[PDB]
Amino acid sequence: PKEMEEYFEMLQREIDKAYEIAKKARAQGKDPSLDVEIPQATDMAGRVESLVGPPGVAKRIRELVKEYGKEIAALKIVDEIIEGKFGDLGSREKYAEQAVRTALAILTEGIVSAPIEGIANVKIKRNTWADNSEYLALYYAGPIRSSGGTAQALSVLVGDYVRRKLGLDRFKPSEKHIERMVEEVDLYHRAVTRLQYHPSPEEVRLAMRNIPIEITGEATDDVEVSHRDVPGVETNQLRGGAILVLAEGVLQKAKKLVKYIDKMGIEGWEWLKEFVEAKEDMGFYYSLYQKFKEEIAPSDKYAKEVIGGRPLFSDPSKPGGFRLRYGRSRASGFATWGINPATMILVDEFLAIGTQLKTERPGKGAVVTPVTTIEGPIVKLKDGSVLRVDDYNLALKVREDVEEILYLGDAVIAFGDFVENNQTLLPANYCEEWWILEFVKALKEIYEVHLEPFTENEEESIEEASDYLEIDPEFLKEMLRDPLRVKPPVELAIHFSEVLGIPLHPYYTLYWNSVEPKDVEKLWRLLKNYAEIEWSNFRGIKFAKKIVISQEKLGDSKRTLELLGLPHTVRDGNVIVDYPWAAALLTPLGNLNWEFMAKPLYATIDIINENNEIKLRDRGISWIGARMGRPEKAKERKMKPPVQVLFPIGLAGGSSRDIKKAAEEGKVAEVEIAFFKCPKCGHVGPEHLCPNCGTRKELLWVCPRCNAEYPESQAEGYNYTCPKCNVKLRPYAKRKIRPSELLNRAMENVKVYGVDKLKGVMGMTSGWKMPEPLEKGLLRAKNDVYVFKDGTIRFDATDAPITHFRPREIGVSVEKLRELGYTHDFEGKPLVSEDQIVELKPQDIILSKEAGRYLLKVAKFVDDLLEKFYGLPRFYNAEKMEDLIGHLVIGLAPHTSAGIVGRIIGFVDALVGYAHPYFHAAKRRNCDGDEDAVMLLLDALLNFSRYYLPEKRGGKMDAPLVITTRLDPREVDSEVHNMDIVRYYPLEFYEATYELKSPKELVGVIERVEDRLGKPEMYYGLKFTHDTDDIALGPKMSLYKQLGDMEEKVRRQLEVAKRIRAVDEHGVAEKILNSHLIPDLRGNLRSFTRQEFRCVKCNTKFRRPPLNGKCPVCGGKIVLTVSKGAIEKYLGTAKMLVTEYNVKNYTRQRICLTERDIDSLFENVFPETQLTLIVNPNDICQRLVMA
Amino acid sequence: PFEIVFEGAKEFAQLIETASRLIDEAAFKVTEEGISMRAMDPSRVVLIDLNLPASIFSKYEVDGEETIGVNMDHLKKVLKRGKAKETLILRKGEENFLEISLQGTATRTFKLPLIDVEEIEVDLPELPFTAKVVILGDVIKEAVKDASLVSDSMKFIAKENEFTMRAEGETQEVEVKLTLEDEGLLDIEVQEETKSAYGISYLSDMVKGLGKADEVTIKFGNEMPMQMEYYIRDEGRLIFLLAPRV
DNA sequence: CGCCGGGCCGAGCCGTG
DNA sequence: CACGGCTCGGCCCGGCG
Ligand SMILES: [Zn+2]
Ligand SMILES: [Zn+2]
Ligand SMILES: [Zn+2]
C-alpha cells in the first residue's frame, strides 16, 4: 500500500544523494569520464535500454509488455526495430544486430550478459555449397554457458525470427557441416567440459537439419577437427559456443523452448515438439514402505564423487540420515535447508552456517542455515547411555563423549523446493505441525469449537476447550500459538489421544519402524519377565514412570533400545529408563497387557495400531541424504596477484609489480599507456589534469607506423586513421615511465607518504589502456583495501535468504529500526520490543561482520578520497561498523552485469550475507551455494569506469554496467515463484503426501509467489512455518579449513563416518574416496613419462630435455613440470585406507601394485640406498604378497 | 605427581633440540632411577636413545614411574626460551599438564598438555661392532660439513690404528684421514677392516650441537649401522643408531 | 656488542588433479 | 573447477667474531 511505496521513495532519495556526490566529484575532470558511469534503471525496460539500446526503446517495451506480456512484446519490439521506428541503423546486418540484441535482452529480462558477453556477432551468409541463398549466422562465445541453456535456447528463436523478418532464407548445411558439428559434440563433451545433457549424434544431426539459422562463432579451444575447412567455417577447432548453444540449449530445454514458440506462435518448430514428446492381507505401513520404495528411487548422484576432506553424512535414503520435515523457516526456503545446530556440532563442526551440502532428494545444492526448533541428533554416549541432544549448548557439553550418532535428526526442506525440482512428495514424517492440526480438527468435529494454530484465538473458544479437556487456558494458548516450542507432558499427550482420539504426540513417538517385529517382540518378553516398573496414574490413565532392567537379562535388546531413539542411562550394570520416555516405551506397548507377536507383512506400527487404544503414526519414514561441499566464504576479492591500483608497471616492480620499489629503485619503465597533453602549457604525462595550470588534458593518439601523435579533436577529424598512414590511430603506446617523479607527484597531491608498498598492474588489459590516477592507489594502500578490474572494491559472500528477523539477532536498536521505517512486526502489532519478528523489507540486507569489518575500511577510503583527492566533505564518517547502517550497497552477481541497490540494516556473526529472496533472485542467484559480490554504492560511483574494463575476456565476473533500484518480483527470476509462503501447511497436504502425489497435483492448496504477482501484496506479507532462535547461532567456520594435511584430512573426513549409523564407511567411504585416490596417482604416473619441461626465466618449455640442460636467453637450468614429489603425494593415505578398512580386493591389489610401479619406475635414478633397521611394520603390500 | 630441578637449562634445551631434529613426538619414561627416552625416526633409519640418571639433577623428585607424552616441537620452542644459567623445573600433579618453571632473574611458568604416544618399543642391545673409535666433536662436525659439499652419503673406513672418512660425488673428492698420532683422534679400537656408508643428512642432524670439548664414541662394522654416543654432564649420555646404505 | 650463513616462513607460481 | 608440491624473497636468527 503506502508503507512500501514510502520505502522505495526513500531509497530513491538516498540514491539520488549518492549521485549528487558522484556528479560533483566526477565533474572535476579528474577521472576518465565527466559523468558517472553506472546508470540506474527501474525495470527490465530500463535495463535493456541502457544495456543494449536502442535509444527510447524502454518506453515502448513497457507498453507492449503492458498489453501482451514479456514474450509477445519482445517480437513486437523486433518489428518496430526492423521497421525503423527508432531511426536508421544502416546495413541489413546492423538491423539484425540491434533487433537480435534487444530481443534476447528483453527475453532474459536483461539480468544476464548473454546479449552482450555471449553473442559474439551476427552475419548474413549464403548457401554457397547448396544454392547460394542467404541465411543468418550467429557467433556465440564461451561465456554464454554462464547464462544457462534457456537464454541460450531463446537466442535460437530470435535468430530464426529476425532472418524471417529480414526476408532471409533458411539454412541448409551440407553433410560436412553436420558431421563436423557432431564431431564437435563428441570431442567437446569428451575432453573440454561435460555438457549438462549429452545428446546422441542422431539428435545432433536432427537439430543440424532442423535449425534454419547457423549456430557458430569463433573457436573456443585448441582442438583440431576432422571435417576441416568446411565452406564458411573459418576455423578447424572446437566451437564451444556453437556446441553449448546446440546441446545444452534447444536440446536440453526444448520443452520450455516450444513453450515460447506456443506463446509466440512461431511456425517451423514442429520437429522440436516431436523431439519433446519423443523424449517423454498386508499391513498399512508395510504397504506404504513398499510403494515408497518403488515409486521413489533412491538417487545416488551426490555420492558419485567424494573429494578428500568432504564428509559423507548419510547414504542415499538410509534411515538415520537427515530425517525430513516439510516446512520453511525464516532463513531457509528459497533453496537452502534448515538444520538443528546440534547436528552441526556433533559432526565435529564440519557443517557451518552456509556450507553447501549436496543433497539428493529435493535437488542438488542445499545451503545450510540454523533452525533451532526442529529436532537435532540422537547420540550414544561412550558409557552406553543414549541421549537426545536437541539444543546447541548441550551439544557443546557432550560433543566429547559421542560414541555413536544414531540419528542426524531433522532437515527442514521447503515445499516449493519440491515444486520447482518437480520431486514426488515423500511421505511426511509425523511432525507437530501435523499433530496440532489433527488436534484442532478433533476439537471441532467433536466439540464444535473453532481454534487455529500459529495465531491467537478468541478467548471464549480457548476457555471452553480448556473445560472439555480440563487444562490450563494459558497453557492451551501457548500450545496453540507455538506448538513447536511447547510440548505437553507425556500424560497430557496420552490424555489428549485418549479423549480426542488423535494419535500420540510426535515428540513422544519412538522410531518404532526402525525395528523389525521380531526384535520388539523379544524386547516385549524381556520387559514382561524381568523389568522393574514403577507405575503412575494421571486422570485414570495408567502409565509407567521408570524402568530398570539389568543388562544381563536385556543383552542384545540394548541395541533395540538404541535404534528406537530411547533415551536411557546405564548405572551399576542396569539399564535405566527415566520418566519422560518410560511412558513412551510402554504406552504404545499397552502397558504390557496385550501380547506383541511379530506377524508377517506387518510393520511394527501396524501391529501397535492394530492392538492399542492409543494409535501412533510413524515418525521416521523419509530420510534424505547429503555430502558436504564448497564451504562458506566471506573473503575479500583480491585479484590473483593482489592489486591496489590500476597503473601498468611492466617488470619494473619485480615479481609482485610493487610500484614503490620501482620508484625508490628509480628504474624506468616501458609500458603501453596513454598520455594527455596540457593545451595551455604543453605538458605531457599519463595524468588527467595539468601540473602547470590544472586544466583537463586532451588524449593523445598514436599511429603504430609513423608514430604520429595527435590531440583528440584532430584524430577525431582524421577518424583516428593516419593522414600519411592508412592505419587506425591507437590511443596508447609502449612508453617510458618514470615511476619516481610520478609517485612523487602523487604523494605531493594527496599528502600521504607512509605506504608500505603499492602493488600495481603488470599491464593494462583494457582497450584504451588508460591508467588509474596514482592518488587513488595511495589511498587504497593507506587503508589496505584491494581493487578489482573495473576499479570497484568487491566482497564475495555466500548468500542465504531470510524474510523475517528478530532485532535481537542482528544487533539493532528498536528505535533505529523505527528510523529505517519498520513500524510493525509481522502480525501487524506495533513494534515495541527487541524480540518481535519483523518482516524484512525487500531490499534490505543483513551483512556478515566480516563485511562490516571490510566495508568499514572501504568507508574510510571513500572519505579520504572525497576529501584528500576530490576536495569534498566526508560522507560516511564511519568509525564502528554500526555506522554503516542505512548506507546502500550494490549487490552484484558474477556472470551478470546489472547490480541491485540494497540497504544495510544490521549485522550477524556468521559468514553469510542475508537478504530477502527477491534480492537474491533478481541478482540471478540460484541460492544453491552461489557466491556474490557486495560493493558500497558511493565507491562504485566514484571509482568505476568502463575504460578499465578488460577488452576481450568477459569472464565469470563482470561489472555493474547498470543498477536496478526497485525490485519487481515479476521480472526477477523463476525460482522465487515457487516459495511456500503459508503460515502452516494445511492438513489436506500432509494427508496428501502419503499417496505420493506429485507436487503439482496440489499446487492450488498451498500459497506461493506466482499466486501473488501483479497484486500490490507481493511485498506486503509473507510468512514462514518454523521459528529459529538465532539466524547466526551455530559453529561459524567450517572445520574443513582448519585441517592442513591430506594424511589426516582423510582421517577426519572418515573419522566421522565411524560415528554415524548412516554412512557405513567401512567399505564405501573409503572405496568411493579410495577410488578417487587411485585415479589421481595413476593419472600422474601415466603422465609423468609424458611431460614437458620449463625454466623459471625462459618460460619456453621444451617438450624434451636439452642434453646440455641450459636454456634460451637464460644460461640456466630447466625445471621438471610434474615433479616426483607429486606422484608420491597420496601413497601414505591410500595405503592407510587399505590397511584399515575392508575394501574390495580389486582396489587393494591395484594400490599395492601401484606402489610397486612407483618403485620400479625409478629403480635406475633413485636407487635403493638407505637400508632400514626395523623392517616390515606390517605393510599391506608385502604381507599381502606373502599370501 | 613429580617435581624435578635441573640447572643450566640452556644445555638441556640443546640436547632436547638434538633429539628434536629427528623425531616430532616422543614419550619420556620417567622412573625413580631417572628420566629415559627412546624412539626412532619416521624413516626407521635412526634410533635415538636418551638416558638420564637422576644424579645429574640438582633435585630429583619422582613418586612412582610414569610416561610423559609431549610434542617435541612445542617443548623445543619452550625450552629454547630458557637461557644460559636460568634454572629449569618440571612439575606434574593430578591434571594432564606439564608445568615448566624457568626461574633465573624471575620465575616463568609454562604448561604443556601431555599427548598420548603410541609406543613402539624396539630395544637393540650390543651388536657385532668391528671397530670402535673415540674422537673430538668438532672433528666429526667439520668432517660431515665437508662431505656435505660433494655428496649425500658419507663413507667411513676404519683400518688398523687409522680412521679415515671420505665421500665422492660426480667430480669432486673429499677425504679426511687421522690416526692416534693425530690430536683429534683420542682412541681407536681396531678389530679389523671396517667400512660403511651413511646418510649425510642424518649425520648432519646428529652432530649439530657439538663443541670442540665434546668426545664421541662410534661403534660399527662392515655394512651395518653405526652407534654413536656421547655423555652429558658425564653421567647421562645419548646414543644414536644409524642404519647404513646400499 | 656486529655480520653472515643458515633457517623459517610467507609468496608466487607453477603445475597438474 | 581446486589441491599439493616447488621454488623465491624477506625476516630471524646462532655462531663466528
Ligand atoms: Zn598547463
Ligand atoms: Zn602514420
Ligand atoms: Zn631459461
Curated annotation (Swiss-Prot), chain B:
Pfam families linked to this entry: PCNA_C (PF02747), PCNA_N (PF00705)
Disulfide bonds: none
Keyword terms: DNA replication, DNA-binding
SUPFAM superfamilies noted in UniProt: DNA clamp (SSF55979)
GO terms of molecular function: DNA binding; DNA polymerase processivity factor activity
Taxonomic superkingdom: Archaea
BP GO annotations: leading strand elongation; regulation of DNA replication
PROSITE patterns: PCNA_1
Quaternary state and interactors: The subunits circularize to form a toroid; DNA passes through its center. Replication factor C (RFC) is required to load the toroid on the DNA. Homotrimer. Interacts with NucS.
Function: Sliding clamp subunit that acts as a moving platform for DNA processing. Responsible for tethering the catalytic subunit of DNA polymerase and other proteins to DNA during high-speed replication. Regulates activity of NucS endonuclease and prevents non-specific cleavage.
Family membership: Belongs to the PCNA family.
Listed PANTHER family: PROLIFERATING CELL NUCLEAR ANTIGEN
Protein name as catalogued: DNA polymerase sliding clamp
Gene: pcn
